[PDB]
Design a protein around this ligand. Structure first.
Ligand SMILES: CCCCCCCCCCCCCCCCOC[C@H](COP(=O)([O-])OCC[N+](C)(C)C)OC(C)=O
Lengths: 336, 232, 303, 54, 217
């Protein structure tokens, strides 16, 4: 009976606490910063060969090997510097939705509507990629997956709960619960000590890999969260939802700092990515193109309209030399 | 993995002979195959090669025309037909496996080999060092001088160090001089610039006793080294 | 030859010029769309035949000005003597390959409508390319003979220098080769048409079968029927009169059958070539500009 | 009874988080940006002689 | 300008040929999406047809292959995984007629049908509505008045009329009728004919696609 009143009181208390820190807006601080100007990129290489919609793609720790995932049931390993296919992993479930690339380059994860995360080992004595481990136990479609080490992987499912799986064992080590909607995105910090998850509740929850509890819950959106990307520094992150507006949260400020939205954009944000310096925010939209925003002084710096279908995923290399953009048109283009 | 060679023995000069290399324990269809001969008390030498799926075949100009290499993926067997055999073809033929892609390690596994006795422009790999007795517990340095600059435009220099133990088949010690093969201890380092290369062994062990071969993989006319024998 | 209609010098120039403009614009648009819409993944046998038809029509148009100027010069050829044969052969090879491509396209449509399952689960690029190359090579080989054969003739005229050098027309007393090729074309064309008519009639019957159960694709079926009927009517009205007047006119000019109604047959033959060019323009319009997307792209641009 | 209890527990735990002024956060953000501005191949152009994408 | 990259290019072209072969092989297989308000209507047809999350049933009929994808176990948000089946050949929606007096069930079925029919991705996808449980419905209609489900049903309690009224109410949900086709049919546990019905419904869409590709429509 009194628990709901106490919850409302705590909500108002945290609201007032966050408001007390709202001294000045990011624009008031960045007024002294010069504009970035027009940013025009060139499609250096187009990676064609898929026979279905490309839904997910991830970059490796070498800036040359990138994994792709489409609805055709194939996982292609592309060599960025030569557009050559290195490996072609056949999938048992063509309904894939996410893909990951291990930091060392020896394992790649894949999941989707099968409620199973399949790990494939690339470094084997044979000449064929074999299944390492099949992690099962989720009651929802796998939305995103990212590796922490060679024996641990964080996976978000469409059951309001995330899970940390240990590969060599195959069981769950930490179940992160607290969401009220289907978890759609995951982004791990550079230190791999804490990761943020965006779900279908207009809220992004931060989680630690060891304890297993929610530290901060950032709100402000008005629709389902579809993309999230951690800031290179590791103390902030951007989140894009179907409301046609990206929002930057800071773990230290504990609230929003600035939003990215234009009156002409009315569609959702499917993917978001940051540059090496964090000054350029890449945003993939359903208008068959991607846009670049200034992280400090919100302004659209350029457009990467080079696809015929929705831009599924975006990826910026660790060195920030090029940007791989995938779309449902079966093409993955490398802009630079 | 397993590669068994058959068809060796005493062959008359000028006769025909078919050698069969049976493979097992891997995707034979997705691995290129090489033939590397080794005459009695002499260095290695490449003979022929087939790529994955028999898409590109290569032969050595020294024995071009007389050797016919073919593959059988359904049965996973590499056939080598030889006609007009001369007194120089007497040697032990090794059936080597390889694979080519970004980060690959070619020439990983070498077959046991088959002995065959017959009764009766290229990149020269100058291996000045022939034999050097070294005591255990000390550092060893094996030099390799090449004729042509193996440093390709892309950057990755193609040069392979192999080690052959007495009475055993050689194995891939180092590929590209900067990446160790799966199964080699962390005691062999490579350092190469232009045409000079050096293999450094920190701690010598009994298993390291053997002949070292420096083979360049810049042009398909592969030429092996002379050999560097060590002792325990 | 002596039979010379004078209205052809005043009729062909402007008609041919307008046809050239319209057809070259249409072929440029069609090539633009086919190049920037259908990648290697989206090239089927029907699309291969359609792009070959576009190229053929384009070549025919590129050749038209050479005859426009000829007819503007009172049927007197001034350009080199070899360009005359070049253009005369280009004209015929383009027209007759276009006819063959239309025929094979109608045959493919027949196969797809009658046997949808057996056609939707098969690759046709190989057969399409093979048939295209075979037809092109055959037509080029047939035209090479008349390319090397002298086709110019000095016909006198009522003037001090009336030695008009006719180009690919007005031949002298009968020439067996010309009759042979004319007869050949007439026969081949008629055979192809009998095939096209059979295909179109079978498609019309299959569409208007009126199933006992509720019709699922009423709108689709009606649009397909209208397009097929339009294409068939255009092809008929444009080509059939040509080949009716063509052979009898040939026989009359070559002196084999100097039958009455020479001037009437000649006049009926001039409007038939007019129809052939009008068709060259109409075919791509009715084929591409109204299929599924050209209307969509036009609306998008205008919207 | 457990749902609301966990809810209030999470609320108070999030309320126990430290407070920081947004001005300092923006200052740190702009400092990190200007510190790595020269190391951004996208923010600033890069010669093709060294760019790995010819 | 290559020392050993030729082998990598050969491998790449070979795996490209392999992917192309697999694509052209999987391009001649019909894809069906099974949906329903309850397992009662879905599992009956799943087991009636010939030979974890999603369930893939592959069956061949008259040299034509069909892969039916059942996503009933996926209780997550449908809006986040329904877009994957945009290129589905047809949507087989099963509804149990013997469910109006087993409370509201038919209301949820109609809601789901309207949601999947007027969706952004299924603007032109064909829908085959299988009304199962014919015997139980004919048996219970005599006892339970149909007015409980349709308060505006001013008719007789006979089957040949109540079934027609239900079919009309289900077909009146498509706000756009000229672009979509609804294949309504009644079935039971011993019909064995639904295979031919689905085959005809798929051949219709195949003929439509051929007319589109052949240069018509
Ligand atoms: C599938 C359909 C038919 C397929 C068979 C295809 C075979 C292709 C044969 C190639 C024909 C080569 C040309 C030699 C054909 C020989 O044409 C000779 C002329 C041209 O007759 P015309 O119609 O009055 O031409 C005047 C029109 N202009 C002057 C504008 C050109 O005829 C005379 C004067 O007797």
């Amino acid at each position: 009976d009194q628990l709901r009143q106490e919850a409302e009181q705590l909500k108002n208390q945290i609201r007032d606490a966050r408001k007390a820190c709202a001294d000045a807006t990011l624009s008031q601080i960045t007024n002294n910063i010069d504009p970035v100007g027009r940013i025009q990129m060139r499609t250096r290489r187009t990676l064609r060969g898929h026979l279905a919609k490309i839904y997910a793609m991830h970059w490796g720790t070498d800036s040359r090997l990138l994994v792709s995932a489409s609805q055709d049931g194939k996982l292609i390993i592309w060599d960025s510097y030569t557009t050559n296919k290195v490996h072609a992993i056949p999938l048992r479930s063509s309904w894939v939705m996410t893909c990951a690339y291990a930091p060392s380059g020896n394992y790649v994860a894949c999941g989707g509507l099968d409620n199973i995360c399949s790990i494939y080992n690339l470094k084997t004595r044979e000449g064929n990629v074999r299944v390492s481990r099949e992690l099962a136990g989720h009651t929802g479609y796998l939305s995103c997956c990212r590796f922490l080490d060679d024996n641990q992987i964080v996976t978000s499912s469409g059951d309001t709960t995330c899970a940390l799986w240990d590969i060599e064992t195959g069981q769950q080590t930490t179940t992160f619960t607290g969401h009220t909607g289907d978890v759609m995105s995951l982004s791990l910090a550079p230190d791999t000590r804490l990761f943020v998850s965006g779900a279908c509740d207009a809220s992004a929850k931060l989680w630690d890999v060891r304890e297993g509890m929610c530290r901060q819950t950032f709100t402000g959106h008005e629709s389902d969260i579809n993309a999230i990307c951690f800031f290179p520094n590791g103390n902030a992150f951007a989140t894009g939802s179907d409301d046609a507006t990206c929002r930057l949260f800071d773990l230290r400020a504990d609230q929003e700092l600035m939003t990215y939205s234009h009156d002409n954009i009315i569609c959702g944000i499917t993917s978001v990515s940051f540059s090496k310096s964090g000054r350029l925010l890449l945003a993939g939209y359903d208008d068959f193109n991607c846009n670049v925003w200034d992280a400090l002084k919100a302004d659209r710096a350029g457009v990467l309209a080079g696809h015929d279908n929705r831009v599924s995923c975006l990826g910026v290399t660790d060195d920030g030399m090029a940007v791989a953009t995938g779309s449902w048109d079966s093409f993955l283009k490398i802009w630079n | 993995v397993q590669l068994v060679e058959s068809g060796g023995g005493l062959v008359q000069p000028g006769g025909s002979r078919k050698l069969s290399c049976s493979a097992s324990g891997f995707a034979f269809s997705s691995f290129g195959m090489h033939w590397v001969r080794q005459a009695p008390e002499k260095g290695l030498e490449w003979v022929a090669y087939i790529s994955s799926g028999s898409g590109t075949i290569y032969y050595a100009d020294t024995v071009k025309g007389r050797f016919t290499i073919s593959r059988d993926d359904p049965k996973n067997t590499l056939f080598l037909q030889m006609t007009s055999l001369r007194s120089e073809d007497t040697a032990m033929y090794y059936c080597v496996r390889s694979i080519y892609y970004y980060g690959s390690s070619p020439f990983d596994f070498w077959g046991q080999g088959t002995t065959l006795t017959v009764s009766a422009a290229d990149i020269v790999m100058t291996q000045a060092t022939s034999s050097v007795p070294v005591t255990p517990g000390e550092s060893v340095s094996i030099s390799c001088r090449s004729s042509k600059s193996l440093l390709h435009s892309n950057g990755n220099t193609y040069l392979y160090w192999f080690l052959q133990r007495p009475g055993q088949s050689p194995q891939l010690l180092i590929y590209r001089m900067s990446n160790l093969a799966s199964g080699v201890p962390d005691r062999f380092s490579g350092s190469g610039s232009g045409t000079a290369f050096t293999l450094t062994i920190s701690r010598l062990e009994a298993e390291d006793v053997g002949v070292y071969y420096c083979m360049q993989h810049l042009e398909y006319p592969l030429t092996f080294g002379a050999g560097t024998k060590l002792e325990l | 030859s002596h039979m010379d209609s004078e209205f052809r010098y005043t009729l062909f120039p402007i008609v041919y010029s307008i046809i050239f403009v319209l057809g070259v614009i249409a072929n440029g648009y069609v090539l633009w769309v086919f190049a920037r819409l259908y990648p290697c993944k989206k090239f089927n046998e029907i699309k291969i035949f359609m792009v070959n038809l576009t190229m053929a029509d384009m070549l025919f148009l590129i050749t038209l000005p050479l005859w426009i100027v000829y007819y503007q010069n009172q049927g007197n050829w001034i350009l080199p003597k070899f360009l005359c044969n070049v253009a005369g052969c280009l004209f015929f090879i383009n027209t007759y390959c276009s006819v063959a491509f239309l025929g094979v396209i109608t045959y493919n449509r027949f196969q797809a409508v009658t046997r949808p399952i057996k056609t939707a689960q098969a690759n046709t690029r190989k057969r399409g390319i093979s048939l295209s190359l075979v037809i092109w090579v055959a037509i080029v080989g047939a035209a090479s003979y008349f390319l090397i054969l002298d086709s110019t003739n000095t016909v006198p005229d009522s003037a001090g220098s009336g030695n008009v050098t006719r180009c690919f027309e007005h031949y002298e007393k009968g020439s067996v080769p010309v009759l042979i090729i004319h007869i050949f074309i007439v026969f081949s064309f008629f055979l192809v048409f009998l095939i096209i008519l059979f295909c179109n009639l079978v498609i019309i019957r299959t569409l208007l079968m009126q199933p006992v159960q509720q019709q699922r694709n009423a709108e689709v079926k009606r649009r397909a029927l209208w397009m097929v009927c339009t294409v068939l009517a255009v092809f008929i009205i444009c080509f059939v009169p040509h080949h009716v007047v063509q052979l009898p006119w040939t026989l009359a000019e070559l002196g084999f059958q100097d039958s009455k109604f020479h001037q009437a047959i000649n006049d009926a033959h001039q409007v038939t070539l007019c129809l052939l060019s009008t068709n060259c323009v109409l075919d791509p319009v009715i084929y591409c500009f109204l299929t599924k997307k050209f209307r969509k792209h036009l609306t998008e641009k205008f919207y | 009874i457990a749902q609301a209890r966990k809810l209030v527990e999470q609320l108070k735990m999030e309320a126990n988080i430290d407070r920081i002024k947004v001005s300092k956060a923006a200052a740190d953000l702009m400092a990190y940006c200007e510190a790595h501005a020269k190391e951004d191949p996208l923010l600033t152009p890069v010669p093709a002689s060294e760019n790995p994408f010819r | 300008l290559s020392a050993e990259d030729k082998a990598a290019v050969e491998r790449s072209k070979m795996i490209d040929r392999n992917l192309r072969e697999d694509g052209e092989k999987a391009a001649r297989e019909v894809k069906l999406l099974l949906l329903g308000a309850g397992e009662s209507g879905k599992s009956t047809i799943v087991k009636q047809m010939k030979i974890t999350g999603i369930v893939e049933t592959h069956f061949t009929f008259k040299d034509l292959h069909f892969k039916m994808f059942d996503v009933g176990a996926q209780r997550s948000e449908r809006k986040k995984w329904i877009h994957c089946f945009e290129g589905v050949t047809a949507i087989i929606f099963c509804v149990a007629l013997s469910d109006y007096d087993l409370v509201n069930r038919m209301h949820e079925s109609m809601k789901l049908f309207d949601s999947i029919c007027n969706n952004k991705w299924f603007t032109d996808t064909s829908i085959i509505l299988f009304l199962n449980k014919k015997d139980l419905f004919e048996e219970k209609i005599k006892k339970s008045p149909l007015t409980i489900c349709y308060p505006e049903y001013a008719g007789s309690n006979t089957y040949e009329e109540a079934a027609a009224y239900i079919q009309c109410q289900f077909e009146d949900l498509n706000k756009r009728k000229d672009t979509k086709e609804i294949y309504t049919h009644f079935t039971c546990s011993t019909d064995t004919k639904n295979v031919q019905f689905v085959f005809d419904a798929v051949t219709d869409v195949i003929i439509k696609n051929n007319l589109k590709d052949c240069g018509l429509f």
